A paper describes a structure:
A key component in the generation of cellular energy is the F1Fo ATP synthase, a biological rotary motor that converts proton motive force (pmf) to adenosine tri-phosphate (ATP) in both oxidative phosphorylation and photophosphorylation. The enzyme is based on two rotary motors, termed F1 and Fo, that are coupled together by two stalks: a central rotor stalk and a peripheral stator stalk. The central stalk is comprised of subunits ε and γ and rotates during the enzyme’s catalytic cycle. E. coli and other related bacteria exploit an internal subunit, termed ε, that can sense the environment and inhibit the enzyme under certain conditions.
Here we present cryo-EM data showing E. coli F1Fo ATP synthase in different rotational and inhibited sub-states, observed following incubation with 10 mM MgATP. The three catalytic β subunits in the present study were identified as containing β1 (βDP); MgADP, β2 (βE); ADP and β3 (βTP); MgATP. Masked 3D classification focusing on the central rotor highlighted sub-states in which the εCTD adopted either a condensed down conformation or an extended half-up conformation. In this study we observed the εCTD in two conformations, a half-up and a down sub-state. Strikingly, the improved detail in this study shows that the transition of the εCTD to a down sub-state is associated with a substantial torsional flexing of the central stalk, as evident by rotation of the εNTD about the γ subunit. This flexing, in combination with bending in the peripheral stalk, mediates rotation in the Fo motor. When the εCTD is in the down conformation, the central stalk is no longer stabilized by the εCTH1:γ interaction, likely increasing its torsional freedom, and the εNTD rotates relative to the γ subunit. When the εCTD subunit is in the down conformation, εCTH1 can no longer bridge between the εNTD and the γ subunit, thereby enabling the complex to open up to an unclamped conformation and allow a greater degree of flexible coupling between the F1 and Fo motors.
Numbering used by the authors:
A (entry chain H): 3 to 136
B (entry chain N), F (entry chain O), G (entry chain S), H (entry chain P), J (entry chain I), K (entry chain M), ...: 3 to 79
C (entry chain a): 4 to 269
D (entry chain X), E (entry chain Y): 1 to 52
I (entry chain R): 3 to 78
Write the structure that this text describes.
């Protein structure tokens, strides 16, 4: 198959062989596969799904990152990553609770955009625990 | 004789151009509708709303042409 | 009955009228020219469908409860929420008229279009053989006069709101100075904005009509030209298709009426 | 087609159905809906003040 | 042409149209009917829990 | 006399073509309007305003052509 | 005779223009469907539902011309 | 016959082609307007002023045909 | 006489415009298929399936025009 | 009489075709101008210079056809 | 006689439209192929196969048109 | 009568199509020039030197068609 | 006699439309080739191979139209 | 001998469609050339070579249409 690496400055999040993956992006997520074109790619808040050889899956939430794809060995240089069992649905509710606080907190438009991104992050965490149940 | 015969051709041209105009027109918006939905699936019911708004605007003149086509063909003949 | 395909299609586009200057019913082939000659059948079904609408809605509205609603009460509160949502998204003024206007347009146009799905001879057959009327055809929105009557209604509302909310000084400004700004272009600007303003509602009425006239005509064609053993297989797909048309045309006439009054006033 | 007195007769029915819908149909229905939404609103209120 | 045959063909076409509507247009309606109430159904109960 | 047949044809041509031009012009412009929503969700009240301003320019000449076609068919013919 | 040789051309104009309009309009919409379905395959059933819905919108207006075109050619002759 | 009816046909060709040209040219130009306004939502007043500059040129050549068409119908015919 | 050659001309108009519509709508559709294929060689059969689905919709009107063109031409 | 009366149609064809050609060619060119303007909005007067450069070349043939059409109307017919 | 003249005109318009439709349809499909090959030339044998698979459907109708155009000119005469 | 008449009609169609050809072809070429100017404005004097070269080829055939148009009107009469 | 009048016009419509289809089809396919050559030079001969493969298929129907227009002109009339 | 007038009409349709096909064909090919030069200006003399090689194919059919239309206009008429 092909191998994917996933890291952040705080930690290596995943690395290994993958039959396939699905990954967040800018204009939404994309599927990625061995045969996919070598698309260097920006990332907005969301998840990646890690389906390893013989079809076994992991489900990672990402704050953000960049998905370089020159090779078949691809990498996500994530800004911050937590897995769907390293977080839990209560921790995703705490992320949502922080987002609800941030929505309340200030009037400034870039602050409001940060709060909106924190909401998108929190819902992406909830969605990754749903993917983890799936 | 031509007063009978030509009216059918005039209606034919009216409903032919109406069919090309209406069919070609919304296809681009329908395209941005499906690609945009594929890109931002969260926004689908919203974009769908906006889609309806621009689609009801694309229909005015071709419906003028086709309604008068049926007038020419059946009322005056 | 000895009607040819074309002849029966004819009698299916033939209309019955009542002469207001003589109270005579109108012959299958000899119309009076005088415009005072009401298209009675379409009026009858139009007003009776509007009466049914208002009776059905009043019977709930006089009793409706804010607990969990009954099965019928829910189907009315749904369309109320659906209409309110569409208005609120497009209109931001104070006027109490716009939301019920949207409602009455939606439900009445919907019920008038719904007549097109029935078997094309059922009511005309009964109206000739049981009642003996010299003609009938039942789809009200399939005649120009009702759809332009509704459009002229909306045009009078458009004028009223463009006069009320911004006055003659603003309306005259917008009609003369745009689009070319300079006073030098006023005679040309009057042409460009005037034909647009007057065509918008007239187009809305005929926009619905250009669908329901062809709709009925298509059913007439399929029932007239084809033999019965092949009528069904080509009629049924059109009926299924025309369901989406009736629903969209009702939604369109509502939405566009809100769009016009919003763009006119604010 | 042919202009006819139906163009005038239908305008009366439309205007009158809008006036009656404005008075009788719309205010009681929207009243019942908003009375429900409001009431589902007010319960969510009590939680914040009580917990503080 | 036999006009009664046209009425026969129209009858069969209506029957088959009804059969499509019943199986593909009505259930989305009874779905939405139940759904309308269901979407905010638990909302009323959620208000009393805060008082608790 | 035969002359009346040509007047319906003339209105047929002018109105059919105006249906072509207004249908495609609103299709293109209204697809760009829909497409504009992909990147951000804070522009539908603004863009919908601009859209009606420029769309007013798109259908005006088509509506003139149709108005003269209507005059020719009903009044002149 | 001289009368009927032109009604087959009124039909030809209605069905030619409606075939061009319906085919290219559906071509525009369907390619956008295959593109978005290439980006996110999980959506393919969802997009497929949106695809047939908007295709129902596009094809509705051009089809009429073919209906009357069959009337003209086999009933008016 | 040949004097009056052809003049209405000439008018029909002049203002039907002017409807095609004035409607499609602004549909294309205004879509690029709405694309820029989506990339740079701070620029819309500037871009709209530029759009009016370009739109004047787009409409100027069709307006010759529309004014002359009205001349042919009222003054000549 | 004059009647028959005008019938051949009417058939030529129907079947020619049908050629334009069926050719261009599949050029536009197949280009998107080929770019998706060049992007997803992994889903060529899947995309090709979808491609036939829509292809059946594109061809629907042009084949009516072709069947009538043959009728007008050879059967009347 | 037909010899001069059809020259109004000849001029109608000439300048209506010129109007569609010019209006659409200017629509495409100005679209690319407005997108260039949105990408670098400090740059507008330079690119607008290059627009006024090439637009002159776009309109030259249409303008000579409009001039000859007007000549065929006011001088010959 | 004149019958030949009209039959040659019918075969000429049928083959002419077939030439436009078939050549522009393959020019679009092929532009997509050449770009997908330029992006990664390892798939040239694979894409060039999908190319022929789609191009087969592009040329289905235009060769019916050509086959009958040839028939009209050489056997209807 | 109609011999000299038709010569004017042939010149009207010849110059009309040449005006569409030259206007559209320069519209497309100048739009790509403007977009290269917007991406790399300091490179404009070189691209302008390439535009003047390609534009001459674009206009060369549309200007021999106009020359024969004037020949048909003035010399053949 | 009357034969040459209509037979030259048939040949003229035949090779004129063939000139449209062949010039637009090679314009689109060639522009994709030249962009591919700018994007990845030193692959020019490979891309050129692919370009000749597709070009042979684009020129198929237009060359039949050319060959038969030559036949009608220098053989039938 | 009325025959002369139609030959000028047939040459007019050949050279009019040839001027459209060869002008829009070179307009699309050259716009892709200019985007290539804006990206890779050191490659311009290489792209000019490929552009002249492809342009020689774009003008193959149109120079046949102009060749025979100019023949028809002088030698045959």
């Amino acid at each position: 198959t092909y191998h994917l690496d996933v890291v952040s400055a705080e930690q290596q999040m995943f690395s290994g062989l993958v039959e396939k993956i699905q990954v967040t992006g800018s204009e939404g997520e994309l599927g990625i596969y061995p045969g996919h074109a070598p698309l260097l790619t920006a990332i907005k808040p969301g998840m990646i799904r890690i389906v390893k050889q013989h079809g076994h899956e992991e489900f990672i939430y990402l704050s953000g990152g960049i998905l370089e794809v020159q090779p078949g060995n691809v990498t996500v240089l994530a800004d911050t990553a937590i897995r769907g069992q390293d977080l839990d649905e209560a921790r995703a509710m705490e992320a949502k609770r922080k987002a609800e606080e941030h929505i309340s907190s200030s009037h400034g438009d870039v602050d409001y955009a940060q709060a909106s991104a924190e909401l998108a992050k929190a819902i992406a965490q909830l969605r990754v625990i749903e993917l983890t149940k799936k | 004789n031509l007063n009978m015969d030509l009216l059918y051709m005039a209606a034919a041209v009216m409903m032919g151009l109406a069919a090309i105009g209406a069919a070609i027109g919304i296809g681009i918006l329908g395209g941005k509708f499906l690609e945009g939905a594929a890109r931002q699936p969260d926004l689908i019911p919203l974009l769908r709303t906006q889609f309806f708004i621009v689609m009801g605007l694309v229909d005015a003149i071709p419906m003028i042409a086709v309604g008068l086509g049926l007038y020419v063909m059946f009322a005056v003949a | 009955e000895n009607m040819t395909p074309q002849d029966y299609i004819g009698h299916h586009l033939n209309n019955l009228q009542l002469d207001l200057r003589t109270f005579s019913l109108v012959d299958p082939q000899n119309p009076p020219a005088t415009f005072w000659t009401i298209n009675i059948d379409s009026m009858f079904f139009s007003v009776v469908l509007g009466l049914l609408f208002l009776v059905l809605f009043r019977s709930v509205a006089k009793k409706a409860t804010s607990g969990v609603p009954g099965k019928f009460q829910t189907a009315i509160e749904l369309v109320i929420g659906f209409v309110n949502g569409s208005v609120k998204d497009m209109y931001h003024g104070k006027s109490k008229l716009i939301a019920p206007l949207a409602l009455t347009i939606f439900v009445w146009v919907f019920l008038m279009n719904l007549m097109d799905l029935l078997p094309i001879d059922l009511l005309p057959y009964i109206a000739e053989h049981v009642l003996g009327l010299p003609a009938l055809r039942v789809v009200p929105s399939a005649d120009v006069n009702v759809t332009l009557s509704m459009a002229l209604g909306v045009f009078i509302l458009i004028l009223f709101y463009s006069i009320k909310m911004k006055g003659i000084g603003g309306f005259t400004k917008e009609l003369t100075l745009q689009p070319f700004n300079h006073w030098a272009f006023i005679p040309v600007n009057l042409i460009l904005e005037g034909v647009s303003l007057l065509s918008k509602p007239v187009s809305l009425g005929l926009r619905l009509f250009g669908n329901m006239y062809a709709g009925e005509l298509i059913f007439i064609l399929i029932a007239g030209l084809l033999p019965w053993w092949s009528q069904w297989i080509l009629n049924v797909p059109w009926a299924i298709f025309h369901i989406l048309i009736i629903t969209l045309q009702a939604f369109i006439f509502m939405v566009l009426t809100i769009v016009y009054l919003s763009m006119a006033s604010e | 087609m042919n202009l006819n007195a139906t163009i005038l007769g239908q305008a009366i029915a439309f205007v009158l159905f809008v006036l009656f819908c404005m008075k009788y149909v719309w205010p009681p229905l929207m009243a019942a809906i908003e009375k429900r939404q409001k009431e589902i609103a007010d319960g969510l209120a009590s939680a914040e003040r009580a917990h503080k």
